[PDB]
Design a protein around this ligand. Sequence first.
Ligand code: ATP
Ligand code: ADP
Ligand code: MG
Lengths: 128, 578, 385, 40, 470, 312, 41
Amino acid sequence: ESAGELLVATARTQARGEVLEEVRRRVREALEALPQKPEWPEVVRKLALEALEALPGAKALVANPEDLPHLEALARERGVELQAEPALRLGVRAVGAEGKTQVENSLLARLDRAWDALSSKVAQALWG
Amino acid sequence: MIQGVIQKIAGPAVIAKGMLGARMYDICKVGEEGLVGEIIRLDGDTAFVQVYEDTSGLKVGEPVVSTGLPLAVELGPGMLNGIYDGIQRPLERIREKTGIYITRGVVVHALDREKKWAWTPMVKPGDEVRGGMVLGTVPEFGFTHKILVPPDVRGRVKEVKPAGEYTVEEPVVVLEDGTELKMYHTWPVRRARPVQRKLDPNTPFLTGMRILDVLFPVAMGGTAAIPGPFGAGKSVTQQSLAKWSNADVVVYVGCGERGNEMTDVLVEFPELTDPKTGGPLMHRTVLIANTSNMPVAAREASIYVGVTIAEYFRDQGFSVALMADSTSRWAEALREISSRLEEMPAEEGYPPYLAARLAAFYERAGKVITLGGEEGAVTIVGAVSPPGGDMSEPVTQSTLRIVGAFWRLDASLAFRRHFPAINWNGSYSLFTSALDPWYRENVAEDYPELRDAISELLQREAGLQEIVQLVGPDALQDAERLVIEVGRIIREDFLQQNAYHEVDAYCSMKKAYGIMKMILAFYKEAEAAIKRGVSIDEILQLPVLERIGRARYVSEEEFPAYFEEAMKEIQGAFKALA
Amino acid sequence: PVQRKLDPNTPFLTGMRILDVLFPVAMGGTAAIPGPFGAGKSVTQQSLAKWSNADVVVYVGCGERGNEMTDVLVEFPELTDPKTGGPLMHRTVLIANTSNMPVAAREASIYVGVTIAEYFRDQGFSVALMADSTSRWAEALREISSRLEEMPAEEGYPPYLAARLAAFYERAGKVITLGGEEGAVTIVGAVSPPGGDMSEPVTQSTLRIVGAFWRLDASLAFRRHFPAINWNGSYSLFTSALDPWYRENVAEDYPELRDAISELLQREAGLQEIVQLVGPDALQDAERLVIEVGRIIREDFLQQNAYHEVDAYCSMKKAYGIMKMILAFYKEAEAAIKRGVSIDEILQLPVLERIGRARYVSEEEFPAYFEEAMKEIQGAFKALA
Amino acid sequence: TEALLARYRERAEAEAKAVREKAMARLDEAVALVLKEVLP
Amino acid sequence: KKEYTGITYISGPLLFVENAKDLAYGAIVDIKDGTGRVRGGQVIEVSEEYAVIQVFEETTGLDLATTSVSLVEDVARLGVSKEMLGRRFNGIGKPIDGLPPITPEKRLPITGLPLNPVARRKPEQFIQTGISTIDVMNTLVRGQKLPIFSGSGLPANEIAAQIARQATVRPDLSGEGEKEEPFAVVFAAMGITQRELSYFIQEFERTGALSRSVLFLNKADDPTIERILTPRMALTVAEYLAFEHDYHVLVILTDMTNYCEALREIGAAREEIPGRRGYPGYMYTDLATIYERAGVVEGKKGSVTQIPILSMPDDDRTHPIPDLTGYITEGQIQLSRELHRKGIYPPIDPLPSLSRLMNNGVGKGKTREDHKQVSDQLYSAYANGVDIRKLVAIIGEDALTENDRRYLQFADAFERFFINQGQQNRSIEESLQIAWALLSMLPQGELKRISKDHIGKYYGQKLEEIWGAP
Amino acid sequence: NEIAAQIARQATVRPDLSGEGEKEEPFAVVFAAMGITQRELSYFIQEFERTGALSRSVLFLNKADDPTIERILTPRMALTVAEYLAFEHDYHVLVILTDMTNYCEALREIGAAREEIPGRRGYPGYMYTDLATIYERAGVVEGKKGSVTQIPILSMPDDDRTHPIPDLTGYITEGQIQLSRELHRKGIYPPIDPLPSLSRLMNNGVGKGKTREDHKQVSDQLYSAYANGVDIRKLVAIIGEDALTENDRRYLQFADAFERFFINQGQQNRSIEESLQIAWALLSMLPQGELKRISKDHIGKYYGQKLEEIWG
Amino acid sequence: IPGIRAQIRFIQQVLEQREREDTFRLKRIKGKIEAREAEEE
Ligand SMILES: Nc1ncnc2c1ncn2[C@@H]1O[C@H](COP(=O)(O)OP(=O)(O)OP(=O)(O)O)[C@@H](O)[C@H]1O
Ligand SMILES: Nc1ncnc2c1ncn2[C@@H]1O[C@H](COP(=O)(O)OP(=O)(O)O)[C@@H](O)[C@H]1O
Ligand SMILES: [Mg+2]
C-alpha cells in the first residue's frame, strides 16, 4: 500500500528537482552574459578588492586582459602586480607572498558555493 | 595571569606557546570558547594542556589563559539537595540555561550566589582564630551549617558582620591583615584535608540489616566492598543503606554508569522519605552523576569531588556515608587517560599506579578529631563490577588488600527469593575482633559467643549438603535432620529481611541478639530432648517455632516483652512436649 | 567499469560433493578456504581448475613452491577440457610467482590476475579465479611497510590491509558488461594462518567479506581423511538463492534432502559430546543408530578421493542419488529399531557395502545402479520383518 | 492488480505537473533573488 | 575560494601541506590533482609548520607539483529535513537512489551533544516487533539499547530486515491516550558487500517499508572514514526527527564489528599506540558516544530506540567488542547456531537472552495483564526440558517419569511453534495465545510461576499455530 | 643426527623396480654445519669415515665457538657448490643442513642490530623470503641428469610446532619428518611420529612401474588404523579397558604392535619389499572387512600373513 | 576441571606477556625514529 504512494513521492521529488535545475541553469546563464555589459568593470573592482583584502600581503594579481585597464589603476595603488590570463573567465585570483596560497572570487564559483544556503530560500519562495 | 596562544592541535591534546610561568596540573581555558584544560607537561615556553571536551573547530592562534590553580571544589552552604556532574556543575541550572543538551563551554557556579542565608556570628572582634574554628551558623533544612575558617588561614579578628540576611559572596569576617572570610572557601580535590588526629575505629556502623550488622560488621570510618551482579539487589541495598543508616549526611557518587541506571537513581531518591523526620530524603544528600558519554576527566575526578565534599561535612562535625556506584568504571576511565598519555601499560592495560590511587582514595575515610576539636567520621562503601565476575581481576585484587570488609553479593540467593542475597561464604569482616569490647560493653557480655555459635551452626549446616543432594532431607538421622532444620530456621528467620516492611526494614542490635539467643536455646533444648528420646518430626510442630518465625514484624519498643514470652514458652514447651 | 551488478542465481559447479551440496557457491560469489599447511588447499584448487563449468580459468600462484608449480605446467597440457574435449591448457591462464622470486612481484601478481579475469569477463564468459595464498601476499605488504618504517597495526601488518583485501574481493560478481552481454567472475582464495590460528588478522578480515567459507580441519588431515572440510566451522550464504535452480535442474526435493542431511549431521555432532563423556556403549539404541548413520555419511558420502579415475568428479545427480539412498536406509533403520531389533545386527547387513561402493561407479552406470540399490534397500528390511 | 498502480502513477503525474506549474510562476523571482544574493 | 598548494609530503593516507594555519582541526577538505579529479580528506592535525590531511580514497595520481587543497566545512555537517523519508544515502549524505538532492531545513553537527541526565525520564512503553521470542520473553521498551549478538554465518541481515519491516507502536493497548504518533525507522549499514546491499534494497522496496524509513548504506570497499561517520549521521537524523517532529524512531545499526575494525585502522593510521588486543584505548568512550544517544526526554513525546547488531568474532563473549557493548547496553538477543542448523527461523535462543528493562514496559495498562508471569513460566519450563532432552539419550525414554515426558513434548513443540515462526507477523495477543496453548500441555499445578486467576482465565487450549490463532 | 647419518649411509634408488637405468652412482654429500658443537661434529666425522664417504663429501663447518655472523653465508656457499656440481657435472647431490635454528638466530641478531621492525617473537619480517632463498635451491632441471636433494635439520624450541621457524619452514618446504619425544622415551628408534609428518611429492614416486602397486592404499590403511588406535587410547584413558568391545581391543593391539615393530627397527636396513611385508603382516591383525581403503584383489593377493613368521 | 583451569591461566598469561613485549618494542622504535627525525633533522 505504501509502495504505491512511493511513486507519487518520487514523482513530486523529481518535479521539484527539475524546477530547481531550471532555476539554477537560468541563474548560471544570467551570470554568464554579464561581462559584456558595461557594468562588468564595476564588478571586477569589487571582486578584486574583496579578494585582495581577503589575502594579506598578496604578491600579484591574475585577471583577463580585458579587465587589466580597469584594475591597473586599482592594482598600482594597491601595490601589486597584474598578469593577463586566457583562463580565469569572469573571475579574479590573487596569490600569496610565498606563492603557496591563492584566493579566487568568481560568479560561477560563488553560485556553487552559496547554492546550499540559497536552496531553502528558493524553495520557500517558489512554493510559499 | 599567564596568557598564551595555541601552536598545535592534535586530538584532545593542545600545545601552547608563550606560557612561561604556568604551574603543573593547573586549570586552563583554551580558545575563545574557553574550554577547560589541564596542564600535564612543561617544556621551554611550551605547555601541554589536556582539553576536557571535544576540540573540533579550534584553530592555531586562539588565546589560552591559565587560571593558576589546580582542580578544586567550592565548599559551603548550598551543597545539600544538589545534583552535580563530575567537576561540581549544577545540572539543574544547566538545563535551565541551555535546554536538554549540554553544550560545550557552559559556565555555572557550584554554590548559588543569589540565595539569602540568615547569618549568626559566633566570634567577637579581637579573638584569635585558627584554621578549623567555627565563625558562625546558618540554618539549612534543619542543619546548623557551621562556616569554618579555611585550614591554612590564621590571624586575629578585626571586624565581624552582625546577624542578618546575607548572600554567599558577602565578606562576613575581615582579619587584621586584610584577609576576608566569606561563607565558602575552595580546596583542591587531590589533597586531603588536615585533621588533628585519627582515632582508630572502635564503634560499629549500624547498617540497618541483620546479616550486615551481626556477621560482617563495619566500624565507623571503615571501608567495604561489594560486587555488582545483575538482579541481586545492589541498588536496593544501597538505597536501604542511605535511608536507614546512622550517617547524618549521605553522599552518592555515580562515576560513569548507563543512562537508564542514572535516570532511575535520580528519579527514585526524591520520592523517598528519611524515617527520622519524614521530610524528603534528598535534603540530606548530595548526588554526583556521570554518564558514559561524559568527558573522561569528569569521570576520573568524580570520586575525588565526592570524597572531598564528604571530608568537608566531616569537618563540620557530622558523620557522612559515601557510596561509589562502580569503581570499575572509574578504573576504566583511568586506563583510558593512561592510554592517552602513551604511558606503559602494566597489567591488562591498567597503569602501574592503580593501587596507589585506590589506597589514597580509600585512606581518607576514618573517625578523626577535627581541627575545631569536635568529632567526625566518613564511611566509604565501594562497589566493584568486574568483567566476568572474576575476582582475580587486578582492580578487585588491589581493592581487597585495603578494605576491611567484603560483602560478596550473589544472584543465586536472589533467584531463591532470599533478600538480601549476601552469601555467608566468601564474605568476611576484619573489624569483629576490634569491635568485640564495644559489643561486650553495650549489647551483652556473651554476644560474641552467641554470634560464634550461629556461625558454627551455619558452617555445620553447609558441612553436610552433599548427602542432601545425593539422597535427600527425609532419609537422614535425627541429629542431621535437626541440624538442617536449624539452619533453615536461621536462614528464614534471622538472615532474610524485607526492606519494604514498615517495621522490619530496620533491626537494632538487641533484636538480633534476642533472636540468636532464642534460636540457640531452642537448639540446645532440642538436643537435650533427642538425648532423652524424641522424634524430630514431632518437634517440627512446636508452637515456639511459629513464635520465633513471627519474632520479626514487631516494634522495637514491643520487643523485650515478646522476647521474654518466647523464652518462657521455649523453656516450658520442650518439657511439656517431648 | 560495468553497466549493472546482478544477483547470483546460478551454481558454480566444482565437482566436489561436499562443496557442491553442503556449502554451495554461486556463479558470481566468493569463497575462502583457510587451513594449516598439509590440509589440502592446493589440491582442492587444482581440482576446481580441472573440473568446473567456468569458461576460462585464471590460476594465480603467489608464493607457490617451485615443484608444485611445475606439476601443473606438466600435467595440464595432457588433460582434457570437460566442456569441449580440447586440451585443458587452452582455457587456462597461469600467473606464477614462486617463493624465491622478488617480493613486490608477489604483491602485484594478484592484481594482474584479477585484471585479466575482468577482461575475459567483459568479453562475455564465465571466469573462475584461483588465488593460491593470500597470506603470502599479506607478508609482502608487511615487508614493504616495515621497509617504509611505518607504524604497524597488529602483528606487523599495515593498517590498510583490510581495505586492500576488501578492494580485491569486491571485484567479483555477475555483471552486465558495457556491451550488454552477461559475464561473471568467481574468486576462490586460500589463506594460511600461522600455526592454523584462525584468529589471525588476515583470516578474520577475509571472513567478514566472503559469501562462502570452507574451513579445513587439522585433525581430519592428520588421519588422512580428505578433503578434510570442517563441517562444524563452515558456512555458505548462497543456499537460499540457488534453490529455484536446484528444483528445476536436479530434483524437486533436493533442498529437503540437503536440509535433512544437515539436521542429521547436527544431531550426530550434538550426541558426540555424550559419546566423549561416557563412551558409545552408554548410549541408547536410536542414538547408536544416529552415530552409525553419521559415520556412514562422513566415510562414504563426504569423503572423496581426488586421484581416483572415477571418484575425482561427481555430477549433481550422483550426489542426489547417494543422499536418497542414505536417507531411505535411515528411515528403514528407524522403522526396524521401533520393532525391537538391536544395533550391531543392522550394522552387518549386506547392503552397507553396496552403499559404500556407490561413489566408485561411473557416471553412465549410476542411473541404473541407483535403482537396484533402492530395490535392495527396500527388500532387505521388510524381508527381515 | 495494476489498477492501483496506474491510479497512483496518474495522481503522481497530476501532482508533479501542478508543482511544476506552481514553480513556473515564480521562476523569475527566484532568479532575481539568487542573482541578488550571489552578486557582490 | 581559498585553496592551498605546496604539498611537502605524501605517504599512505597522509599528506602534509604548508601555510595552512587557517584550517580548523577536523575540517573537511577537497584535494584536486592535475587530471581534474577531486578527492575528499579530513584534517587530523594542525600546527604552525604544516597541517596533516587524511585522504578518504586512494592517492594513486597525486604529486607534489600540481596538487591543491581547498576547504569545504570547518566541521562535518548534515542537512536534515522531514522530507528525508524514503531516500537512500551512501554514508556521508550523498544520495544513491538517483533522486534529486533534498532541501535542508538546517545543517547540524553530526557529533551530537550529550543529554542532560536530569532531562531524562524512565521508559514506560513497548515496541511490537512481531517476533514472539522477542516481544513475549525479551520485550523491547521505547528508549532502550538492546543489541543482537550473532555469529559468523547466522542470518542477522534477514532478522534485521524483518524487524525493520514489521516494527510498529501500539497506541491501542495504551488504554488511555489511545492515539498514534508517526513512526520512523533509521537503517544504518556499515561495511556491507554488494550481495547484502542488493538484498536490503529489494526487501525495503518490495513491501513498501521504504517510505517510512531512512537508509544510510556504506559498502565494504568504500573509504574507512565514511564507515566511521555513518552511525553518527544516522543518529543525528534520528535525534532530529524524534525531538523536533515528535516521531517515534527506531535505529538499526548493522555489524558494529565493522565499525570497530574501521576505528582500529583509523587509530593505527594516526600512529597512536594501540591498547589491549590491538584496539584503541578510547574505544569504550567512542562506543558510548554512539550508544548513549538514545532515550526519552521529559516534556517531549518522541523517543529513540537502538538495536545494534554485532557478529561475535570467534563466538567468544570475552572479545572486547561484545564486552564493552554489554557494559553499555541493557541486555542482548542471542542467536543460536544449533537452532539455525536445525532449520528454525528466526534462530533466537531464549535461554541466553535478557532484557534489563522488560519489567517496566509490560503489565497492566501497557500490555496484557499476565505478560511477565507467562514469560517467567515459559523460561523455566524450557530450561527444565532442555536438560531432560540430554538425560534421555543415556537413561532412555522408558525410564522417564510422566512429568519429564510432558517437559520433552513441551520443549519440542515450543521449538517447532513458538520460535519457528517463519516470515509471518505475530501480534502480541496472538503470540500470547500461542504461549498459553503451549503452556496448556503441562499439567495444571506445575505452573508455579503463574497466579491462579490467570491460569483459570487462560488454561486449557489446544494448538493455535495451525489454527492461526483466530 | 643419527637419523640423518643413517639416511645418508643407506639411501639409494631402485633402478630394477622402475625398469630403467642401472647402477646409479652413489649420492654425493654436501654437509653444511651452523653452530655445531664438538660432540655432534666428531660423531658426524666418525660416521662418515666409517662409511667411507669423505672422498665424495664437501664439508662446511661453522662451530659453536665460531663468530655468529659467518652463519649468514654458509648455507648459500653449500648450495652454490651443490647446484654447480649437479647442474654442470651430472652428479646426484644430497644436502644436509645441520641446524636452521642457529641460522635464524644469527638472522635475528643482524636484523635487530639494524633497528628493523620485528615481525614476531623478535624475528625479522623478511624471514620467510630469506629462508625461501635457501630452501628453493633444489630440484631437477629438464634436459639435465643431475639433481639436488635437501634434508634440513632444525630443533623446535620446547617442541612447539607453532614457533615461527618451524612454521615458516613447513610453509616453504615439501613436507616434514616430525620426531616425537613420547616414542623416544619408550626406547623406540627412530622416533618418527607418522601422523604429524607429511610428504607432498609421494604420489609422483609410487604406483605401477615405480614400486609395488598397493603402496598408496597400504599407506592410507595404516594411517587410518593408527589414528583409530590412538583415539581408542584416549578413550581407554577414561572408561577403562574392561568395558571395551572386541573391535577397540583389536585396534589397541594393532597400535601397540605398530609402534613396537613397524617404527622401532634400530640400525637395520630394510628394503621396500620387506617394509611392505611387515605392513601387511600388521594389517592382517584387523578383520578383513575393516580394510576399506584397499581394493579387494589386493587383499586376496597379500592379506593373511602372520607377523611372527617374519622374524627368523 | 582444575587442570583445564591451570592450562587456561597459563595460556592467557603467555599471550598477555607477548602482547606487552610487542607493544614495548613498537613504542621504543617509534620513539627512536621520532627523535632522529625531529631533534637531528
Ligand atoms: N532486600 C530486598 N527486599 C525486597 N525485595 C528485594 C530486595 N532486594 C531486591 N529485591 C527485589 O529486587 C528488585 C530489584 O532488585 P534486583 O535484585 O532486581 O537488582 P538491582 O537492585 O536492580 O541490581 P543491579 O543494579 O546490580 O542489577 C526489587 O524491586 C525487589 O522486587
Ligand atoms: N582429496 C585428496 N586426495 C588425496 N590427497 C590429498 C587430498 N587433499 C590433500 N591431499 C594430500 O595432502 C598433502 C598436502 O596437500 P596440499 O593440498 O598441498 O596441502 P596444502 O596446500 O593445504 O598445504 C598432499 O600429499 C596431498 O596429496
Ligand atoms: Mg601449497
